[PDB]
Design a protein around this ligand. Structure first.
Ligand SMILES: Nc1ncnc2c1ncn2[C@@H]1O[C@H](COP(=O)(O)OP(=O)(O)OP(O)(O)=S)[C@@H](O)[C@H]1O
Ligand SMILES: Nc1ncnc2c1ncn2[C@@H]1O[C@H](COP(=O)(O)OP(=O)(O)OP(O)(O)=S)[C@@H](O)[C@H]1O
Ligand SMILES: [Mg+2]
Ligand SMILES: [Mg+2]
Lengths: 404, 402, 101, 51
């Protein structure tokens, strides 16, 4: 009988070996051939905030040192992002993990979870993270997590850079099981070695994910077969959170459009709550279902966790000029005001261009594209004022949630 | 110390069930008080493919009965959509199934599936199905399954026109869950009298979806803990498909954006896959990831389906002028030609009106209001339907033989 | 010595795209020699008449030359170009076979 | 924030009265600001207070 459907299943194969090809050419085509945006003595002022006098003093102190400054084709000064973070390293400006006021802090775990497909969590959240990383005055050690097995956050120009030299790896899955060589114990040095990777920024870091992570849900069903205390919830907490809380301060986490055991652990173990969403009716209805589903499930999780300290909703794909969606936003501000961000993330062709070349808004400048300037200008400025207002929620709660 | 947290979540939920009721009231205000815009007796010749003499023969056979062809503000025969269905039902034109040559048919079991979301599952499926409905010459019977827990086809101008004769409108999950009176069994009679409801299209019904569906993911996780035989896949097929194929010619399974036990069940059950993946470069990256994940998963499955039959990736919200996205279409065509649909679903404000107003592309006419904009909207949608349904023959001849 | 032609396909033309009989014929063709017949459609409009009467192919003239049979010519040239790349993609997949015969 | 169908309903309810929607240099309906106020006053949309 299933002669032609041996043909047909091994022709889903004889097409996904051609898609194995296709990914080979995708890798060959994405390859970097780019330079990071320069600060032009005014963009430097706007972004870093260093005064011209102190900047001159520091760049001279470094100029007499080993490193040499560089200039554009014109004698006008131009300093690269690498040179930027180097001058920050040598600025002596301490971070939240070096400030005498507060240096022994735990991670500020920030998450982006929506149960609605394709509406913006990936792109908006990676944009938000790369913008928060623009806080060069403070050198945040940031961990981007692409917990969505299909996110491009390991590939999208803030990526998990798995060069050819990269030998082997053990994803969050294998941290949920300790499937590394049984002889070696998973210590934080191992975590730097094969879990924490750079993102072409000397400050921003990441974790990668893989479609094999979907097998985690099957293994969790198997564990429910072998367990009944729902103890897999704490598997994340001890394996990952206790091992990472010692030596980082922020962890960007994308989770995916889905609500699943993996995403249940992401929800629970995390000590902060953010809720991405759009202004559409059905989306907010799904959020209603979400607000019914949670409380009982949190009751299911161990009583040791005293609930998440703050809850806020997000906009996205917000055209800002459609009557229905602004009415929805008004209703949200009417119901959970002070627990929803005011900031708006608009949609424009500039984001499309950014995505198609994979390059985040910061990676490209006006010369790269057309005059979708002010659109990108107000996009990055809303994302940065939104980053400081979410981090100001976190500031006012650096009394509460750090002591629980 | 989660008192604050939980009671506050219940307080959002309490003020927001009010928003749910407000949406229901918005429906009540918006509930049609009207039906599908009728045909003009020339669109009869165009889409129903009946020559003038044949249509006069049909109305000579019909009109002398008690029926009256209701006229609009003018004497022009304003044949209602149901009126047209009845007319050509008894006119003597054999249906696509009842026609003697093709009566041992394997119905289409179509899929729109992409583990990456926001690509246009439900609206592509519903536009395609609705346009397929209006091929009258052979009076196609169509079937559309909203299997998304957050799905919103229920009131979507395939709406809740629910004859209260049904015990309750049980959602596709609640057929899977068996949230039914235990007295009745799963039989075509039970489905007919208790499950599916009319949708302004006598050629269509829907299998519904309510928010509590999400917990069935957990339920089937507990089931997979109960047993590892993976036989859960056959639940959908055996229980529902075999009994619902009786009354319809084309079946569509909207798997939804998830990759959850539900959607492995569907993937296995579904035997023909459209992939409405808006070709945008990062969408295409997520669908290359799609095209690693599915070969492995399908390889894992047992040996009782005839795989899939074709893929016609229809680029959703397409523009044809955006330099980057039209170039992306070119890479579509080049990297993976010979397996993609040439025409497109152009992005138009008509489609956003379709979405937010809980409507379909066809149930509102030009008079409903746009103009040229939506005119070209359904022109493109209906050319795409022609092309699609031609593919449907092209592989359906394979279906009858399997 | 000639080992037959490597591929056979049929074309549409003058395809009004809205006549029941002709779409039924196209369905029957797709039913019989599917994968060996192009899906693309060549519609008929007054723009082609204007093109012919001045001899000028659609590309030689623009909107300022004629009336607003724009979208008709737009979709005509776009169907012809996607059809050109799909026939040349038949030829691509057969640049293994028919070049070596 | 009125959909096209709602605005045509409003002008179907209004225009048959003595009012004329004044056109500009072209036939394009140049609804004056007061004209818009009246239109949506009696169109059936409840005000922020009267609702
Ligand atoms: N500003 C924007 N401009 C253009 N496309 C956008 C924009 N925001 C979101 N998108 C869409 O989102 C797609 C990819 O981003 P995401 O929406 O994050 O996908 P995702 O990971 O499924 O997140 P969700 O589920 O939509 S919240 C793009 O291909 C677009 O279709
Ligand atoms: N032109 C459009 N107008 C409005 N919404 C659109 C449009 N194109 C895509 N969408 C999105 O699609 C949703 C409804 O259609 P679907 O895409 O089928 O929803 P779905 O079941 O979540 O499948 P996904 O996740 O979008 S692939 C809307 O809520 C939007 O998020
Ligand atoms: Mg996503
Ligand atoms: Mg599907």
């Amino acid at each position: 009988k299933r002669e032609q459907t041996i043909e047909n299943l091994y022709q889903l194969a004889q097409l996904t070996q051609q898609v194995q090809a296709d990914r080979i050419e995708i890798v060959l085509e994405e390859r970097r051939d780019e330079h990071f945006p320069p600060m032009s003595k005014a963009l430097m002022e706007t972004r870093s905030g260093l005064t011209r006098r102190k900047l001159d003093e520091a760049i001279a102190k470094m100029e007499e040192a080993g490193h040499q400054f560089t200039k554009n084709n014109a004698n006008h000064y131009s300093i690269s992002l690498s040179e930027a973070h180097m001058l920050m390293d040598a600025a002596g400006v301490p971070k939240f993990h070096e400030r005498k006021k507060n240096n022994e802090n735990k991670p500020w775990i920030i998450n982006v979870q929506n149960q609605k497909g394709g509406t913006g969590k990936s792109m908006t959240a990676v944009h938000l993270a790369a913008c928060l990383a623009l806080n060069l005055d403070k050198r945040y050690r940031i961990c981007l997590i692409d917990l969505d097995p299909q996110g491009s956050l390991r590939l999208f120009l803030n990526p998990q850079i798995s060069l050819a030299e990269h030998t082997n790896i053990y994803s969050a899955v294998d941290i949920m099981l300790d499937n590394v060589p049984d002889g070696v114990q998973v210590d934080t040095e191992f975590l730097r070695k094969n879990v924490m990777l750079p993102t072409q920024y000397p400050n921003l870091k990441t974790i990668s994910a893989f479609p094999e992570d979907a097998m985690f849900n099957a293994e969790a069903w198997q564990y429910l077969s072998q367990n009944q205390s729902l103890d897999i919830v704490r598997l994340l907490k001890e394996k990952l959170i206790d091992k990472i809380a010692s030596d980082f301060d922020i962890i960007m986490i994308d989770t995916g459009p889905h609500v699943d055991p993996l995403v249940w652990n992401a929800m629970y173990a995390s000590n902060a709550l953010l809720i991405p969403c759009a202004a559409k009716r059905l989306d907010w209805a799904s959020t209603v279902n979400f607000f019914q589903h949670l409380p009982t499930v949190y009751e299911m999780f161990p009583e040791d966790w005293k609930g998440l300290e703050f809850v806020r909703l997000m906009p996205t794909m917000f055209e800002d000029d459609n009557k229905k969606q602004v009415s929805v936003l008004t209703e949200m501000n009417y119901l959970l005001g002070d627990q929803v961000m005011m900031a708006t993330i608009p949609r424009s062709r500039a984001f499309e261009t950014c995505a198609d070349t994979y390059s985040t808004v910061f990676d490209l400048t006006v010369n790269d594209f057309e005059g979708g300037k002010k659109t990108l200008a107000t996009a990055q400025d809303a994302v940065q004022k939104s980053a400081l207002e979410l981090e100001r929620v976190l500031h006012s709660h650096w009394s509460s949630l750090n002591q629980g």
